[PDB]
Design a binder for this molecule. Structure first.
Ligand SMILES: CCCN(Cc1ccccc1)c1nc(Cl)nc2c1ncn2[C@@H]1O[C@H](COP(=O)(O)CP(=O)(O)O)[C@@H](O)[C@H]1O
Ligand SMILES: CCCN(Cc1ccccc1)c1nc(Cl)nc2c1ncn2[C@@H]1O[C@H](COP(=O)(O)CP(=O)(O)O)[C@@H](O)[C@H]1O
Ligand SMILES: [Zn+2]
Ligand SMILES: [Zn+2]
Ligand SMILES: [Zn+2]
Ligand SMILES: [Zn+2]
Lengths: 524, 524
């Protein structure tokens, strides 16, 4: 009975330090979770009990908190070396700072293999990057060998900044030949480790012959078998079992995000690489598991550089600024309302006497709100708090749109509602009412907008023919999140201030904030 | 043909200077209206054409602008003397500063008779005030005599500060004997000049025998015959004709408010005091009528004391702050939301950790918003502008009421909707929906309120059993405007800051304001 124990994180997103249960900054240490020091402790506990253990990361360590803004990746390489990871697949956000943002910080410093089989470099890059990332890696595990093939999101050119000298092929098309090569090398146990979302994960397990396990990410999927230990709601059992086209039962696993859970899968292999059985569950890394002192001290040695971003208090908040995905991708959220009001507050300028201000409206992709902010620490908001909410460093731009163009974006906002996708829109100066029973593209039942050509701002139904000015993220003006209609049909695009400075300025102007949910978005 | 011309103002409310068409502070002088200097000119033009002319005031010169805050009445005595008024009835706001606030400034300095027949003093006051105001006055007009009887609102003890040494009798009960007294003195032409509202004016004209004309006020009633000259909508023809119980046609007149119009009524009397005919109309005092230089110079001589209230700029506004009665007494108006938003912003104090703040709601009687604020002066907001919006100097108190108490107050808010009454409520942290088709007391179809025991403020239907904290004017906690349920059923009443300082502070904190109409109040 050859047993393998796969440990896997994904979408850790720079939460090196322990976090609150909402993955925001750790306020009350007696209830905090995650961290790489607590992960070390738990990983060790298992490497002692089990002889055959592999530790894998399925992408998206980059971006999320002030840890990445400063060290820009070097912190990721250091503490993944300290955790002695056995392999890592590349995610889209690993290209957030371009290829150069990945080679010098991460690739050149990792002491473990970094994998991606559907990325191929060309031109000046093929010599600069050759050998720094592999399509697969055959790892020794005891007296056997396990092959691990990497894959990265086909859509990463649209999601990030890979550059024009990197081609991203269809995952299944590129993975299949690499798996066949490993089989011809007499490797009968093969793991697919990648970053394309749960739905592609299930397709890779169904169509790629010879994949025994798929360990994925990118969709922050929580799977659990039984009664779950925390707030996260499971999308299915752990592992999710896929029956391949050639007749095999192929487990598919993922461990949410933000370092909260450690995926734990046990696989019973026969002598020929057949999977007899698979069982496990993600392990909640709560306060019961102590942080390893040696890693924690190295954390604090690196933590002294970051305390320069929590020195200055920008303002206070007396409400919970709910920027969780469970809210801002499903309903109106007060962090969404906060961010939009500050966007409108920044574009206030004198104009014609037949107007009160040139722009009265705001839209904001919920997926762009990347973290909540707790108020129980005497409500203080520092730059560190804001850098977790708006980590990407985009801008807040002025656009101009036709009533019909806006109507299509709000139909798109809910065209696949229910899957926790980022395109759900938070709004300002807009009152939208949805009806999901109606068919996609015909679910905006009401859409009223705040008038600009009026001495008293008031709400008036959207007119398709009219033309409106909107403050939106740079991410959306360029067609992000599937908002092609915006990128195509806009009548004007003026660039604006930094998204983090716009929100830093408006919180100091107000000194104390209490944004509410007031019906800007409603459901029939 | 003995003809009499009655000129009458009413509810001037301290608008000594010329004003904007909304009666707010005069921005662009080439379009401004009213003023005592422009009234003078028009009065003169008529005294030259007609030999028999009476100029009357039907009450409520006190309170309304910074002129009254500073000079406290002396400006009324002075500039009513300079226009040589022939008589003045006492209004409710004439007692806003108590009896002594009426005796020393106006009564002792008026060179015209000040009339009120239904007010009788008692105790220590009856010798201090005897002869400073009369129930009637028989004035010579050419070779005839006209009797003028004063009356003041029966409700003045609830509306103002008359004191316990003044009794207010039923108008009709008190006027009849005085009118009978004048008849026995062979006075066959008798005018009723008083301050009880258009509805009582019509009743005084119907039930008091021997009254030939009723010249009233207090309800800012606009009457016009034909096509009106400005925004004001007429409530009826000018004069409104009442058929008395004893068979006479009795004209009843009123001239809006704020000095915008000069009432102009011509009456044809026969030899025995019968009314042969009555016709006229209010005269719009617009820019075509020049301001009298001599009054304007005396106006400017007095204006130097007041310019210390426009020196300091508290903030700016880029929207029209609509504090007009036609908006703020019928529908949501953005001046109401502003005042309520500042009330909630002021009662922010740390509380139990299972709350975001103790108070989330606000109610505000629309009639307490006493002036709009124009923004075309590059929107500067000074103290002078605010003292016109909140002239009374009340406070904003914290009260505690049962859901049923509040449900009753909002049924009262619209229980006689449509007559421009002050009890219509402006709100904050509350979403109310009315249905006027339904019967009074059964017109609040929806009532949602902003939660306090919640880390994310959101709106939840009113629960009758629950208990809520509300910020409301001191005027409402005490049962004003007919909100008895609050005074009776409140579980707590703590006094707060000045109504004018709360709104001055919140306008500086924000630096630039743009309050909108956002659906806090809606109509089925
Ligand atoms: C200046 C733009 C800055 N960037 C990134 C970037 C950098 C460099 C070049 C291009 C783009 C972003 N700007 C905004 Cl405004 N929203 C974003 C951005 N990137 C992700 N989201 C949202 O996130 C959702 C997925 O979140 P997720 O947790 O489900 C899976 P992910 O971990 O792979 O992202 C999506 O549905 C989005 O709504
Ligand atoms: C500290 C309280 C200060 N006072 C007056 C006062 C002074 C001294 C002692 C007691 C009371 C008021 N406070 C407020 Cl907050 N609103 C008020 C007050 N008095 C009238 N309104 C409103 O005005 C409406 C009528 O307006 P109207 O112009 O149509 C006819 P009016 O000229 O005779 O009043 C009414 O329906 C109300 O809603
Ligand atoms: Zn991610
Ligand atoms: Zn991703
Ligand atoms: Zn009045
Ligand atoms: Zn009055």
């Amino acid at each position: 009975a050859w047993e393998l124990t796969i440990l896997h994180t994904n979408d850790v997103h720079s939460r090196l330090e322990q976090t609150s249960e909402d993955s925001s900054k750790c306020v009350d240490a007696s209830r905090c979770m995650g961290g790489v020091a607590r992960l070390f402790t738990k990983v060790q506990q298992i490497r002692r009990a089990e002889p055959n253990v592999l530790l894998l990361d399925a992408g998206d360590q980059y971006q999320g908190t002030i840890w990445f803004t400063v060290y820009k990746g070097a912190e990721v390489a250091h503490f993944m070396n300290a955790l002695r990871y056995d392999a890592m697949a590349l995610g889209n956000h690993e290209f957030d700072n371009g290829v150069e943002g990945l080679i010098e910080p991460l690739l050149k410093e990792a002491k473990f293999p970094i994998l991606s089989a559907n990325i191929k470099a060309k031109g000046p890059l093929a010599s600069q990057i050759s050998g720094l990332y592999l399509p697969y890696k055959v790892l020794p595990v005891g007296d056997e060998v396990v092959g691990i093939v990497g894959y990265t999101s086909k859509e990463t050119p649209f999601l990030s900044n890979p550059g024009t000298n990197l081609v991203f092929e269809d995952e299944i098309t590129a993975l299949q030949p690499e798996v066949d090569k490993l089989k011809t090398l007499n490797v009968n146990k093969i793991i697919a480790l990648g970053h394309s979302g749960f739905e592609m994960d299930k397709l890779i397990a169904q169509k790629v012959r010879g994949v025994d396990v798929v360990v994925g990410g990118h969709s922050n999927t929580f799977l659990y078998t039984g009664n779950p230990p925390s707030k996260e709601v499971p999308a299915g059992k752990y592992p999710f079992i896929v029956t391949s086209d050639d007749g095999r039962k192929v487990p598919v696993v993922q461990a949410y995000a933000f370092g909260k859970y450690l995926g734990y899968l046990k696989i019973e292999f026969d002598e020929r690489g057949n999977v007899i059985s698979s069982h496990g569950n993600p392990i909640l890394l709560d306060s019961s598991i102590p942080e390893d002192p040696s890693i924690k001290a190295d954390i604090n040695k690196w933590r002294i550089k970051l305390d320069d971003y929590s020195t200055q208090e920008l303002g206070k908040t007396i409400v919970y600024l709910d920027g969780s995905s469970q809210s801002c991708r499903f309903r109106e959220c007060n962090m969404g309302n906060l961010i939009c009001d500050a966007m409108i507050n920044n574009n206030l300028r004198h104009t014609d006497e037949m107007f009160w201000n040139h722009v009265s409206m705001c839209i904001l992709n919920g997926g762009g709100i990347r973290s909540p902010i707790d108020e129980r620490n005497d409500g203080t908001i520092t730059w560190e708090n804001l850098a977790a909410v708006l980590p990407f460093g985009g801008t807040f731009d002025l656009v101009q749109l036709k009533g019909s163009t806006l109507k299509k974006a709000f139909e798109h906002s809910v065209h696949r509602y229910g899957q926790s996708t980022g395109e759900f829109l938070q709004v300002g100066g807009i009152h939208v009412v949805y009806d999901l029973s109606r068919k996609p593209g015909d679910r905006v039942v009401k859409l009223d907008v705040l008038c600009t050509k009026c001495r008293v701002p008031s709400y008036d139904p959207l007119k398709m023919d009219e033309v409106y000015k909107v403050i939106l993220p740079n991410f959306l003006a360029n067609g992000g999140d599937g908002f092609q209609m915006i990128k195509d049909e806009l009548l004007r695009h003026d660039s604006g201030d930094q998204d983090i400075n716009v929100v830093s300025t408006y919180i100091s102007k107000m000194k104390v904030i209490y944004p509410a949910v007031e019906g800007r978005i409603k459901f029939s």
